[PDB]
Design a protein around this ligand. Structure first.
Ligand SMILES: NC(=O)CC[C@H](N)C(=O)O
Ligand SMILES: N[C@@H](CC(=O)O)C(=O)O
Ligand SMILES: [Cl-]
Ligand code: NA
Length: 422
């Protein structure tokens, strides 16, 4: 039976895919090209699931043949049914102020070895695991990191003995989801996973598939894009909605955000791939976008591509910056920013800075933020005149060697506001 547990001690907050990742999880026998594993292992830790010591040795030889950086490769020995690590591996959440935990669930497939796998993931990472008794799949889940999550309708229809209030309450208790947005899938295919048509790229940005006017799903996808563009996001502005045109069922929304890199599956034509990559680059300033060709033996599909066959792994020692930015026209008369910073590594934080620029003058300048109370840092912009333009971002570091900015990418994409008070 599924191992349901109590939920984590609160407050709880699900970690978004665009927050720091300490690794990426993949599985052998493989469903991804070796070129992707090589690109991943250049800068990130790759954890490969294998069934035995013998399969570990087989994978090390294949990685060596392909020129993969073995110093960034680790293994978990566990039986698995499939390579869809997106769908059956555990979900990450912060809880109890400064801890990172794993959330297990009932995988919505008759794949009992995949379903059992999250306990091995939590044991490898040395983190606690909580069992949320819902039939779920990670491909059908995404969070903004501020309490919202989007899922297709199967989150309710595959949990039909529970009311929507009961399903919503489990997402609140185990993942800190205060808005569980369960929508009718707009894609007209069997899988009903959000990652085949939608992807948060930041707390204020969402990518939505677009198809030609006469495609049968055209209006459902336009309605979905208009729904996000019409509502407020976690940063108080309306969502920025970006569109990836699939002229022929290319899975352009099925990308992986891993730290400052974005891996986008491409399967042509080349000009249409370039257009899709340039949407990601436009939406995500400062990120490095990589178009990834599929493996010939396990190609990318419209309903199953790169995001489906990977899962980011959160940092157990995450240096977490919580910030609601000051954006756009600001009435004033005060312009005060606040950021909460917590070290899940239990390391002393020093320094916490605001990097800023006024009216585009010179370079960004750092100012130390004031620690008002443990983990709560503030900064007031002084001497600002009407119509002054401010660019800023947050930086923090701790004694474990971690360094983080808010927004994630830092200086390439600062927050901006205009002073309106005289
Ligand atoms: N995430 C996926 O692409 C899963 C595909 C797989 N064939 C399934 O339906 O389970
Ligand atoms: N069997 C594949 C594809 C499908 O179900 O259509 C998965 O699972
Ligand atoms: Cl049921
Ligand atoms: Na499970």
């Amino acid at each position: 039976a599924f191992q349901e547990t109590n939920p984590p001690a609160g407050p709880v907050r699900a970690i978004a895919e665009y927050e720091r990742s300490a690794a990426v999880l993949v599985r052998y026998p493989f469903g991804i090209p070796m070129e992707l594993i090589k690109e991943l292992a250049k800068n990130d830790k790759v954890i490969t699931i294998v069934a035995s010591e013998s399969q570990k040795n087989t994978v090390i030889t294949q990685y060596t043949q392909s020129g993969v950086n073995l110093s960034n490769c680790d293994f978990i020995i566990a039986k698995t049914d499939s390579y869809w690590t997106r769908d059956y591996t555990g979900w990450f959440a912060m809880y109890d102020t400064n801890k990172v935990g794993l959330v297990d669930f009932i995988y919505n497939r008759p794949r009992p070895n995949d379903d059992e796998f999250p306990k091995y993931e939590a044991q490898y990472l040395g983190i606690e695991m909580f069992g949320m008794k819902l039939k779920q799949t990670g491909g059908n889940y995404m969070t903004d990191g501020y309490g919202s999550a989007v899922q297709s309708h199967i989150a309710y229809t595959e949990n039909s003995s529970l009311s929507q209030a009961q399903v919503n309450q489990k997402m609140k208790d185990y993942l800190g989801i205060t808005h569980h947005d369960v929508v009718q899938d707009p894609n007209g295919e069997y899988i009903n996973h959000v990652d085949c048509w939608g992807k948060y790229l930041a707390p204020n940005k969402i990518l939505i598939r677009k198809v030609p006017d006469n495609h049968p799903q055209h209006q459902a996808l336009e309605d979905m894009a208009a729904y996000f563009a019409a509502q407020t996001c976690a940063w108080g502005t309306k969502y920025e909605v970006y569109r990836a045109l699939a002229t022929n069922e290319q899975p352009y929304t099925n990308s992986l955000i891993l730290n400052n890199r974005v891996f986008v599956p491409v399967n042509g034509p080349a000009s249409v791939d370039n257009d899709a990559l340039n949407v990601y680059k436009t939406a995500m300033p400062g990120y490095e976008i990589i178009g990834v060709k599929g493996a010939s033996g396990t190609p990318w599909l419209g309903t199953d591509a790169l995001h489906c066959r990977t899962h980011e792994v959160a940092d157990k020692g995450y240096l977490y910056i919580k910030h609601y930015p000051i954006l756009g026209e600001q009435a004033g008369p005060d312009y005060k920013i606040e950021a909460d910073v917590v070290s899940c590594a239990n390391a002393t934080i020093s320094p916490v800075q605001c990097y800023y620029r006024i009216n585009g003058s010179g370079s960004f300048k750092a100012a130390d933020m004031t620690m008002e109370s443990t983990g709560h840092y503030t900064y007031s912009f002084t001497g600002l005149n009407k119509n002054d333009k401010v660019e800023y971002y947050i930086s923090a570091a701790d004694n474990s060697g971690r360094k983080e900015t808010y927004p994630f990418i830092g200086e390439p994409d600062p927050f901006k506001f205009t002073c309106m008070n005289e």
